[PDB]
DNA sequence: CCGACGACGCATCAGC
DNA sequence: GCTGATGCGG
DNA sequence: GTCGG
């Protein structure tokens, strides 16, 4: 945190680009500019420093020279005080409630905590679980608490079908000390890129998890991938754990080290290593490593047996988990 | 200057 | 019912 | 908002 004050400057300007403005680039921008920044390993003192660091330019290099005088930007104190961006900004804050919905919300007169539950019939199932919840998933979870949690999915995921095989992924497996929700990718034999042998995979899961009470409710639910809720059972007596977001996707088992690098993510981290294997002449998704054509088209998906593979078809140096997290 | 900016699952809606 | 576009999310 | 070409 060398350059804190510098990164969630440009983490509040992502947020009203992306939430006010619905300026989507601008958001991508200011985020890839305070990921930059963030692993600089040296105190900032001068924008013209900053602009040397690739994303940020001389708009951003402006914003860090008037923050380093005087401590706070004026655009920011004005956002700050306009009630309708500041209306719009908070209830983003909702699970399901992005940037049209909230804008759609404000100038229907809903613009607080306490208006979003007197309208409750005007939101979707989504929304309206994101609002039962909302302090709870503005909550961290403890690493601790994590492998809590770790331990249940893998144990109950076992008594379903000894063949499944969780991985928990996100920032969870890039070690971090407290996560924002866990991520859960699946694989089971019966489900490759080549065949569906077995229906219901994930639904037996989930199904499984619901039972045991572990998994409390679903904001959205497809063949490969469950969105919910999941609270860690507490003891006599004993306050009860804030409910979690928990996120679980079930890959073809063949395509494990794909599906493993994706969901450890960063997301930043997966934005630059796609964007470099594009200029490589390559496309990664979740699936698979492609190489693209003189035209421009994907190819044959390209033989992959760990994640280090796909790091080398676009030659970067392998990162582990731990280094991804930008 | 100018196009490009990662890639995609699920929910919801318009139009048929 | 479907396909396609859009919103929202990972 | 930024960048490579
Ligand atoms: N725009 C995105 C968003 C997510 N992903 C991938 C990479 C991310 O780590 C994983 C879970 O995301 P999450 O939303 O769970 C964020 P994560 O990295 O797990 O940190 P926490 O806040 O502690 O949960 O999904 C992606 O590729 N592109
Ligand atoms: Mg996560
Ligand atoms: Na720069
Ligand atoms: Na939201
Ligand atoms: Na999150």
Partial sequence: ???????????????????????????????????????????????????????????????????????????????????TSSSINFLTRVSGIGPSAARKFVDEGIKTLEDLRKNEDKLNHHQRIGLKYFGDFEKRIPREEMLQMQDIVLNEVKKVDSEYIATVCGSFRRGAESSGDMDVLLTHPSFTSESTKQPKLLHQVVEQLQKVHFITDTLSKGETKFMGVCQLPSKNDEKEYPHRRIDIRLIPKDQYYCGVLYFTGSDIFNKNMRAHALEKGFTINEYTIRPLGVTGVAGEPLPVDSEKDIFDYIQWKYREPKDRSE
Avoid at 20 to 36: D, L
Avoid at 59 to 73: M, P, Q, S, V, Y
Wanted: charged residues 30%; glycine residues 8%.
């Fill in 1 to 83: 945190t060398l350059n804190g004050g510098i990164t969630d400057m440009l983490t509040e300007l992502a947020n009203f680009e992306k939430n006010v403005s619905q300026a989507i680039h601008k958001y991508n921008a200011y985020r890839k500019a305070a990921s930059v920044i963030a692993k600089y390993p040296h105190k900032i003192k001068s924008g013209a420093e900053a602009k040397k660091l690739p994303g940020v330019g001389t708009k951003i290099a402006e914003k860090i020279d008037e923050f380093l005088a005087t401590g706070k930007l004026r655009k920011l104190e004005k956002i700050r005080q306009d009630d």
